[PDB]
Design a protein around this ligand. Structure first.
Ligand SMILES: OC[C@H]1O[C@H](OC[C@H]2O[C@H](O[C@]3(CO)O[C@H](CO)[C@@H](O)[C@@H]3O)[C@H](O)[C@@H](O)[C@@H]2O)[C@H](O)[C@@H](O)[C@H]1O
Ligand SMILES: OC[C@H]1O[C@H](OC[C@H]2O[C@H](O[C@]3(CO)O[C@H](CO)[C@@H](O)[C@@H]3O)[C@H](O)[C@@H](O)[C@@H]2O)[C@H](O)[C@@H](O)[C@H]1O
Ligand SMILES: OC[C@H]1O[C@H](OC[C@H]2O[C@H](O[C@]3(CO)O[C@H](CO)[C@@H](O)[C@@H]3O)[C@H](O)[C@@H](O)[C@@H]2O)[C@H](O)[C@@H](O)[C@H]1O
Lengths: 721, 721, 228, 246
């Protein structure tokens, strides 16, 4: 039985196979258990209350009760707990608060912070509402924990109300925190860099503080809003994992602190850096939604739990189970140098190879002949497109292709009519020169006039044109914060920017819900669950190299479903890596993602065209298995591995893709075992027609054979009889 | 379905959840699969046949078939395979053989090598019989693989027949071998030293050869006949483990070889060192029984599989499920300095504290007043015992105690009547001085007159005395091999010694099957599955320190059931470690084994006597849980751990023992989670009366509380309601 | 030879067997070398200036110069460097500063911050004085680096002057910072607890941020002000 | 204790300044008193080592390294406390048994040798000791009066580090013609070969006379062959080697 229960001084938040059990101890909230379901909890793992030196107390005479030593669900500074705090509010002459539990209620169904991306499909949910007050400061803090009946995830956020008659300032306000008992732990995060997105990192939890954070105003290429606290020795197949993640796309922090007693705190939320929030009397602030997800089935267990929750409760219902079109994108194909003739020729060739959607990338607007001007000027360049966009779209439609279009709405070039008309719309500091990045500036989406302008321009574009797909790029990070009328308003503008972005994209995606929107940020610069609430796919990386894509895809699909993960077959030598790879390998690697194409089809040989047509035919078959099926990592492409292998199961279909990076010699063949088959099931391998029992494939495995050479790949295709 | 199947050129050896599948390829036997059950095996994991440089071939024209690269079940040298061989026979001018498969048959039921310890309770077994011949050398080699219907174990041994009319000499003859596919592996072994027996060692498999071996003529304190080849990253709870073990108590070797292709060979058997075996025409040689055991449930999985197989098919049925008596042994209590008065006083005190069995240790025979004489002279010292042994036994019986007695039959002192009468009965080399060890010599049990003498003397002792228990010690290793009439006979004497030992102990244990025989060798110097066939318990270590016993018990029960594992509460400061430990801890540590007592009860305070009486009462309750229940390691006492914890489940009873070695300060309490309970089960903790669900105990766990101090312990006792 | 030297656009801070060599590049201060003595430094280990994606620039047309990628001796936020900053001052509506090197001087002998514990026996020392200004905010930041003739140690601190006619607020102001070239590193710290003081901890440097800190108003039992 | 409840400012900003201003106040106070009374030896303390840093060591030339006075628990504490700070700073006291923090019996000899790797004092009720324990202490004091310059003024060399896995600690001090080495074993071991302990930073050709046996060893022998370290059976045993360079 799942949902929320209040039983004496215990609160039980009960999702599928995951419980959070909280005790009200005289107004203090104690984390008793987070993990697998326990009913009738007695307290076997209660903290032993001891006099711990230099750990102080709320009363004079009791040295054994200390907030420095109790396991909690939110952290304050100044009351004796010296671990990193997750709520800190300035009021009058202090930033000490003492929030005490006052009242609990339970909600059913849809529930979340206003103006921030939050779970959908919430009919079968309950939400625990923990109302806390600081009587002296006349502030309220309300904690929300929501259950899910179909996933081992709990969602959380808080609301802070100013009930005083002075201005108060929020300095810290995270979305989730948990104190875990002293034990050995490891952590997994996804970091990396541009063209190396979502690099999977694993390390031992050590005394002190480890953190990942973005202060770039976007979540960023080099860190994802996720932190996995793992049982020592976790594998792909076994051990406990708790994943904490944030549905937010701006500045964030995730941290793990191991204190002086070996206790462990984890939290995620809005980054304290670049953040303060003024609340006038009666005003309130709600945090973005955090998620805590659990598996006892190792890292593959947590992947599945996280992917399922995303598919069911984050990604738009309209698209979460809808096969995505195989596209052609002209970007690497032509860059800025194109016109109508070239576009339709490319469309002609895309149609012949069975591609479904044609995306017109950067360069169609203003005087955008390079990347040094025109952002902000969303006016069709009818000269370059050889007539109206409407006439181009009709042409593409008449050739049997859906039509897609690139935008970068959050940006403005100095050399643009927009900047000439409104220079104050850029993020900037009075009396400081701009900082430039790809020779462009960022629009101040904390300015409601900016948001209004973009809603108008884009609504016009989408209503007057028959566009099937949008690619929403964002190609620099935020510098020179100084647009506020006060310092405090500047401190608010980075979060207000996000609120502005979310108002904009929720509006357009809702008002044009037939359109498939793909998010982008020089690839995976903002590939997080805030964006995935509105954009059901994402351009995973500007790196389109088949081999460099291996670790990128590993990380990009670690917590997010494969269906989200844009992957394109591109030209050789590869533009980022300067590398030759087989077209077969480029194909098989992209087919582990959401397949498209990004190269000049008009310049290929007859043979290369035929190969591509075969790849398209193959993927039309594999697409449901890849996009709708269950993913199993078999060999992980890490820093030392020479191999990658990923399996997908979907009903009677099982496929396995294998890639070897460097050629080897006098090295015995790898044995590759499949996972999650029926032992007694019979599996017919397409290439040789041989029928193998599931037990054979899982416990004996495939001897993997390759010729001599770098970057070779193969695929095994099975049908269960 | 289990047993043996022959299907075209495949042989299937099918135990419970474990299969060995062998292919006959033109007379060569190939290991196709060893692991979880596969029916209808097709060969997904077949070796890819390739020209591998410097890997030669049985025919000129086919460079892709090589015994250097095929996975096999026995290894020869000289035919192109350069991995370590497991059969090597000298005949005429060569030690090249080429055994080729000729015929297979299947046996049902009881089956094993003559004169060597082998599995019992074999009604539900089948044995694959693979008959091989070398036509040129006129030798036969027959391989036996036996299934078990109730355990994931396969047993193996071989028989080598000389069908030629010349003498041949066996140089190498192992009992089991398997070639495993290139992959990452770790190995676990039990090594250590005297007073540090069965130290659990784990390491990475590396290119080259790793081995453990004894050349001491006994398996030895410092290595056990076991090797566990483990999946990379195996835990207590998860991953594949293959344990290979040997039912032999003499010289052995276990090895893992990683060859030039990354392939892995493992084998166990009689050590080539100190071994050669002459076969005259018509003569044959059978190897000791090896076992291969499998679990996919980590190291606890393999512990359970190994323990269960030992309990059901090795340890004597008469004792395998029989609670063992709590004993007093006088050895540490008095050493050699005792007489009748002291013995009966000790018996009186043992009776008052509820002890069940009184063991008279070394010093009762010949003129054994120290350890410098009298071994070999098994004549009762009626002066020291204050009358006949019969009169002592009656006295002990009348006090309500069973009676036990120490022997060391395999040994002879220079200063003895035995040595004065038969100096040639000692193992020795003509013209070399003795090598001494504890100032004694080893009897040559390869001499049938020695075996006859010991059968006679011991049969007399056991038939004319009402003895309930025997402790069979053996206190040195074998030096100065030179008793043969030829070099070859000397090379045979170490194995013949074992054959002599096994003839002796199988005879006496069978003829006096009511007696509980406990094996001993300065503690755990010969604690192997050869001995455990006849001796259902073993003195695990001369080290009786509660704390030093932690790693010893960990290893001693790793593959062997707890019931086998002698453990005694002894005096402080401890005689081996020079350490004070709490009597409570000595008690709780010994109670994780087969409990007895070894200290001078007559010299204890009234309080210490009362404590012991309480310990005895407690263990009378715990005994079935400990001896008959299922063992779960919760915290392992290794080189870095500061803790040990072991759980036992038996029906409605669950107990957990926890020990902390060094006192800690400002360190959060350990959280100890129980295993293998019913989630919905209700578990009443004896000490506080609180009722916890199995889910709570398994997923939240116990906060473990201790006072300040070294070597503290506690026990949790649960009853399932 | 030890002490401080100014040579064209290089500053050399030279203690016994330890040098800090700083380059003034158009007002930006670059850490060229920290480690064993080098005279006549040419720049073998200079940063290669490359267009690094999402690493922005103080001018529109030069994408290869970025404070996100240059090795520095103090860190600001808002000018394109996104690494953790060590100076951050609120003034008017912003906490963006842009301190630019203006002038260097050299002191001899005793020198240190007023009211804070600082080295003694300083007769054989020299101190590099790097005067930085943010003309817009009308703030000065002055960096001090002091040599020792008998020890491989350099001492550092800074002075921040408000030359504006409004109140300003310092939010961050660390005492030393160094950017080290990509390589494998380990760190040693002294942590522990009450009754377990100064426990020696060693670990691998990993992507992300590791920190020890006290917010107890004393340095504390569980962390020492040291990082190796 | 540590600081809680910050709110003494007339404004929020002044509260935000009070923690640093507190330190400025502390330093004004201690610089004043230590300067005005510079003959006095001031030892800093904070429930032991709660504030053992180089700010304090500017004014307080020694520090109470830890409230933990257990000889064995002191091993990792001293390792860290002298890692970057000189031994002379590092207060260490021989205390009573069972130890008040650890609840542990340790030999008085070991308590002595461990404290003598620091700045030695005593912290137990001397009036309640046996005649024998008093005599031992008098011998320890006599010994340290000799060792004090070597320990406090000499060069420290860690030979075996007491970490989480080590069962041993060993620290050497060189001072002119004097070299001492202290060795401690935590848990008793059995059937384990003796440790070989090599000394550091000696003259290869120098001749080193070991006090306990009178044997003369070259520096090369002590550095490259090393001492076989012998102990009886038992926990928390220690010994000291004392050398004079001839
Ligand atoms: O402008 C369209 C483009 O926007 C995003 O990528 C921006 C990316 O462009 C630049 O690099 C090149 C072309 O000069 O583009 C590819 C990467 O796609 C590179 O191999 C090549 O250097 C800039 O140099 C980068 O700073 C910048 O990140 C979007 O992600 C692309 O898909 C495309 O739509
Ligand atoms: O002789 C009876 C004795 O035999 C086995 O142990 C032999 C063991 O005895 C010696 O050591 C002492 C007594 O001198 O006995 C204990 C160990 O039990 C030691 O603490 C003490 O040194 C020899 O020194 C050893 O070489 C020898 O191994 C048997 O295992 C004992 O249970 C006991 O029956
Ligand atoms: O008050 C004098 C004391 O101050 C510092 O230590 C304070 C220490 O005292 C308490 O603990 C006890 C006595 O009750 O003292 C020893 C430690 O010295 C402990 O074994 C025992 O529990 C408090 O319980 C602690 O919170 C507190 O830290 C100073 O460091 C001492 O040298 C001494 O001067």
């Amino acid at each position: 039985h799942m949902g929320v229960r209040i039983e004496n001084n215990l609160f039980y938040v009960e999702s599928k196979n995951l419980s959070l059990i909280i005790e009200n101890r005289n107004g203090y909230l104690l984390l008793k258990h987070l993990g697998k379901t326990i009913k009738n909890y007695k307290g076997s793992n209660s903290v032993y209350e001891r006099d711990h030196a230099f750990s102080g107390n709320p009363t004079a005479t009791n040295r054994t009760f200390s907030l420095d030593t109790q396991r909690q669900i939110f952290g304050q500074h100044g009351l004796g707990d010296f671990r990193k705090p997750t709520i800190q509010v300035q009021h009058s002459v202090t930033e000490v608060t003492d929030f005490r539990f006052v009242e609990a209620k339970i909600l059913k169904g849809q529930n979340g912070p206003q103006g921030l991306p939050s779970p959908h499909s919430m009919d079968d949910t309950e939400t625990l509402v923990l109302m806390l007050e600081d009587s002296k400061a006349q502030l309220s803090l309300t904690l929300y924990y929501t259950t899910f009946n179909n996933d081992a995830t709990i969602a959380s956020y808080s609301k802070l109300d100013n009930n005083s008659n002075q201005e108060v300032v929020i300095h810290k306000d995270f979305s989730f925190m948990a104190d875990f008992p002293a034990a050995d732990y490891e952590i997994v995060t996804l970091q990396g860099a541009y063209a190396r997105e979502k690099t999977v990192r694993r390390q031992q939890v050590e005394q002190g503080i480890f953190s990942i954070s973005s202060n770039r105003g976007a979540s960023g290429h080099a860190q994802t809003p996720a932190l996995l606290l793992c049982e020592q020795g976790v594998t792909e197949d076994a051990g406990n994992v708790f994943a904490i993640q944030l549905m937010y796309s701006g500045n964030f922090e995730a941290f793990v602190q191991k204190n002086q007693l070996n206790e462990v705190r984890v939290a995620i939320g809005i980054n304290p850096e670049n953040f303060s929030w003024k609340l006038a009397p009666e005003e309130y602030f709600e945090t973005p939604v955090a998620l805590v997800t659990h598996s006892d089935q190792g890292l593959t267990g947590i992947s599945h739990e996280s992917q399922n929750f995303v598919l069911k409760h984050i990604m738009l219902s309209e698209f979460s189970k809808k096969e995505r079109p195989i596209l052609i994108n002209n970007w690497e194909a032509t860059y800025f140098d194109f016109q109508r003739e070239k576009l339709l020729e490319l469309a002609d060739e895309a149609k012949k190879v069975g591609i479904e959607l044609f995306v017109l990338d950067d360069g169609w607007f203003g005087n955008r002949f390079d990347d040094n001007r025109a952002l902000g000027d969303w006016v069709v360049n009818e000269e370059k497109l050889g007539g109206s966009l409407e006439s181009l779209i009709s042409a593409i439609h008449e050739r049997g292709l859906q039509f897609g279009l690139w935008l970068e709405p959050e940006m403005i070039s100095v050399d643009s009519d927009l900047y000439r008309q409104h220079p104050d719309w850029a993020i900037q500091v009075p009396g400081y020169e701009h900082t430039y990045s790809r020779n462009q500036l960022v629009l101040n989406l904390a300015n409601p006039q900016v948001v209004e302008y973009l809603k108008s321009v884009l609504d016009q574009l989408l209503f007057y044109h028959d566009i099937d797909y949008i690619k929403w790029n964002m190609n620099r990070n935020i510098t020179k914060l100084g647009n506020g009328l006060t310092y405090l308003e500047t401190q608010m503008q980075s979060h207000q920017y996000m609120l502005g972005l979310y108002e904009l994209v929720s509006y357009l995606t809702e008002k044009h819900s037939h359109i498939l929107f793909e998010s982008c940020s020089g690839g995976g610069g903002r590939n997080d669950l805030g964006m995935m609430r509105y954009f059901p796919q994402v351009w995973a990386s500007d790196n389109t190299d088949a081999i460099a894509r291996l670790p990128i895809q590993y990380g990009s699909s670690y917590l997010y479903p494969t269906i989200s993960m844009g992957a394109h077959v591109s030209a050789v030598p590869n533009h980022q890596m300067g590398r030759m790879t087989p077209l077969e390998t480029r194909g098989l690697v992209a087919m582990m993602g959401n397949l498209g194409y990004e190269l000049d089809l008009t310049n290929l040989s007859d043979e290369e065209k035929a190969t591509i047509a075969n790849q398209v035919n193959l993927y039309k078959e594999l697409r449901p298995v890849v996009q709708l099926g269950q993913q199993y990592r078999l060999i992980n492409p890490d820093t030392v591995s020479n191999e990658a292998a990923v399996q997908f199961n979907y009903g009677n279909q099982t496929i396995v893709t294998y890639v070897r990076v460097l050629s080897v010699v006098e090295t015995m063949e790898t044995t590759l075992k499949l996972k999650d088959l029926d032992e007694e099931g019979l599996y017919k391998l397409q290439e040789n027609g041989e029928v193998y029992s599931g037990a054979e494939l899982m416990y004996a495995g495939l001897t993997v054979i390759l010729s001599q050479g770098d970057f070779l790949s193969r695929q095994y295709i099975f049908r269960k009889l």
